[PDB]
Amino acid sequence: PKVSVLITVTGVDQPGVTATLFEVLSRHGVELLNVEQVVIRHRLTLGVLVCCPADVADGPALRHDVEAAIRKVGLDVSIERSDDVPIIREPSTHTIFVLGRPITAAAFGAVAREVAALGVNIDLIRGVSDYPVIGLELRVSVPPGADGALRTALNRVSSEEHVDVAVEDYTLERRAKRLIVFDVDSTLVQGEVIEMLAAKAGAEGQVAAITDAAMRGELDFAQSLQQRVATLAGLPATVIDEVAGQLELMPGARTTLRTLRRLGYACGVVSGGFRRIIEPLAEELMLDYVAANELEIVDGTLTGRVVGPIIDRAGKATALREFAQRAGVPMAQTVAVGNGANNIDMLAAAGLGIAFNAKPALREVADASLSHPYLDTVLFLLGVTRGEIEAADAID
């Protein structure tokens, strides 16, 4: 008790160092206040903050015991009275994810520069993936009222340097995300279902043009939906099952859902597409919630119309809110993932809105953007590491 002492051990890592130090300290009236240790690339840092009798800390014996024991095996140690020293470091305010393929040193350099410019302190850096993409996390302490400036600065770095850069709240509450919705077309599934339907009518051309036109936000979603589905007027309803069986999951989708289930997420899809194509898949993927539009069928033939209500841009956010209320999950703990202007209100409503290989209209307002063709890069944004994924998967 009485007086506090800081002991700092550094150098090339060797086994037994940790036990040796506290065994030495036990010969003095040492009680512990804080221990921090890590080994990085065979470099040990062990910082031990203690209190011990004023008697002991004022004597050369504690110093000599520690210095002798540490220096003998080949490491460095410093010892100094503290008293005016933080016992335990404060939590980081935010975390930053940098994803690239590659991540140039220039890219990472620009991130570190923007960070320093805004008075943001880097508390820790670690890797979170080596595949399918290089992933690096920085946990940071952002000055109050500066994280807007920071997201802006880092989105600029992101486009200039060809990496994804996401800044997230690192508070207890915001980290415990519990619910996720995916847009279907070009997010969970490869391509555009409505274009696969249109191709059966020899209309993939017209419909692709309008689809690409609607997802960039240059058109009202409902009017574009009505013109596109009209091109299907006269197709037999059998086409629906046929397109259902041609659907390819986005690379990384099974891994994304599976891992999200391990974490107890409630998972759903919210689509402007069609319930009949989506359900025999949501069932196969064991999803908890589906919202979608519905094709009108007369005499076993599509009419080219949709049965209202239409899930539009507002409808997607409305669906998220509905799902979250039923699931008992506050909006702050919800995640939304999408690629088109169709998805803007949904990402905005969600706690974390993630644009996945998205049109500019969506990236401009999303909380975070992903530019690589791997849906499982979403998991990294959710605080999961690749190693953790592979571990849990290997355990089966």
Q: Is 61 among the residues that bind a second copy (CB under 8 A)?
A: no
List the single partner that 185 binds among Mg ion, a second copy, none, CB under 5 to 8 Å by kind: Mg ion
| Two structure tokens written together for 54 | 């004023």
Using the minimum distance from each CB to a second copy, give the nearer residue, 134 or 201: 134
**Which residues contact residue 368 at a Cβ distance below 8 angstroms, ignoring those fewer than 6 apart?**
97, 164, 166, 167, 168, 352, 353, 354, 355, 381
Active site residue 185: yes
Applying the rule CB under 8 A, the residues between 172 and 201 that interact with a second copy are: 172-173, 176, 178
CB of 188 to Mg ion, least distance (A): 9
CB of 361 to Mg ion, least distance (A): 12
Strand, coil or helix: what is 102?
coil
d(CA 215, CA 186): 10
> Cβ-closest residue to Mg ion?
185
Applying the rule CB under 8 A, the residues between 13 and 32 that interact with a second copy are: 15-16, 18-19, 22-23, 25-26, 28, 30-32
**Which stretch, 130-138, 242-250, 289-297, 350-358, contacts a second copy (CB under 8 A)?**
130-138
CB of 284 to a second copy, least distance (A): 20
- Cα angle at 251 between 247 and 252, to 5 degrees? 120
Using the minimum distance from each CB to a second copy, give the nearer residue, 124 or 209: 124
CB of 124 to a second copy, least distance (A): 5
* Residue type present at position 290: V
Active site residue 169: no
Applying the rule CB under 8 A, the residues between 254 and 273 that interact with a second copy are: 259, 262-264
Nearest CA to 349 out of 327, 378, 311, 323 is that of 323
Q: Active site residue: 185, 312, 367, 376, which one?
A: 185
CB of 39 to a second copy, least distance (A): 8
CA 313 to mean position of chain CA atoms: 23
**Judged by CB under 8 A, which of 54, 61, 68, 106 binds a second copy?**
106
In terms of Cβ atoms closer than 10 Å to its own Cβ (0-12, 13-18, 19+), residue 160 is exposed
d(CA 382, CA 179): 11
**Judged by CB under 8 A, which of 96, 103, 375, 381 binds a second copy?**
103
The DSSP H or E segment spanning 19 is helix 17-25
The DSSP H or E segment spanning 179 is strand 179-182
The set of catalytic residues is 183, 185
